[PDB]
Design a protein around this nucleic acid. Structure first.
Ligand SMILES: [Mg+2]
Ligand SMILES: [Mg+2]
Ligand SMILES: [Mg+2]
Ligand SMILES: [Mg+2]
Ligand SMILES: [Mg+2]
Ligand SMILES: [Mg+2]
Ligand SMILES: [Mg+2]
Ligand SMILES: [Mg+2]
Ligand SMILES: [Mg+2]
Ligand SMILES: [Mg+2]
Ligand SMILES: [Mg+2]
Length: 115
RNA sequence: CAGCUUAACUGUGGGCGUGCGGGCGAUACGGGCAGACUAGAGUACUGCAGGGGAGACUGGAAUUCCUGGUGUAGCGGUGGAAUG
């Protein structure tokens, strides 16, 4: 089909980073990830896979005909700016930037400290 | 001091003998007794800040889960990987 506007969702952890593009109504057009790009071990952790998923989702969404996108990012830093710049260079221009990160107001208890 | 020749020893009466008694005469501090005062203490008049304590009521973000859409091959993980 086609869509004149949508939002690309970004959630990036230390060891992963996925990208999914959704319309405002909540129906997803397409998604991409480093794992699908084919990176295992620490390879996937790179922002490089971030830009790869970036232009991948760009292609698989612009096939459906996405024009305007607003990206939301979350999670700890793994290349957020790198991925957004790669997407911008991919040919899609964002109208507004927004970060909504899961920040629980001291709900539940995090797992023990690493050792 | 006194003599056994000096010798241990004792011949010698004083002196020593740290505790306990009543009678004569003290009152400074150290108790009880005695009435009064307040520099401690305590309440009394008005203000104060506070996650002090107990019960109940209530909001938010989030994890997880159930249900339902969009949606595609992996998601997740560590120095890496498989159990998942
Ligand atoms: Mg990792
Ligand atoms: Mg863990
Ligand atoms: Mg003599
Ligand atoms: Mg004598
Ligand atoms: Mg004695
Ligand atoms: Mg007394
Ligand atoms: Mg008086
Ligand atoms: Mg007083
Ligand atoms: Mg107060
Ligand atoms: Mg109680
Ligand atoms: Mg569902």
């Amino acid at each position: 089909k086609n869509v004149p506007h949508g939002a690309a969702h970004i959630k990036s952890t230390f060891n992963n980073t996925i990208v999914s593009i959704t319309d405002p109504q909540g129906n997803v057009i397409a998604w991409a990830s480093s794992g699908h790009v084919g990176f295992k071990g620490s390879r996937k952790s790179t922002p490089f896979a971030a830009q790869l998923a970036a232009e991948n989702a760009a292609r698989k969404a612009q096939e459906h005909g996405v024009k305007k996108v607003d990206v939301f990012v979350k999670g700890p830093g793994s290349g957020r700016e790198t991925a957004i710049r790669s997407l911008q260079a991919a040919g899609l221009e964002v109208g507004t930037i927004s970060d909504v990160t899961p920040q629980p107001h001291n709900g539940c208890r995090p797992p023990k400290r690493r050792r």
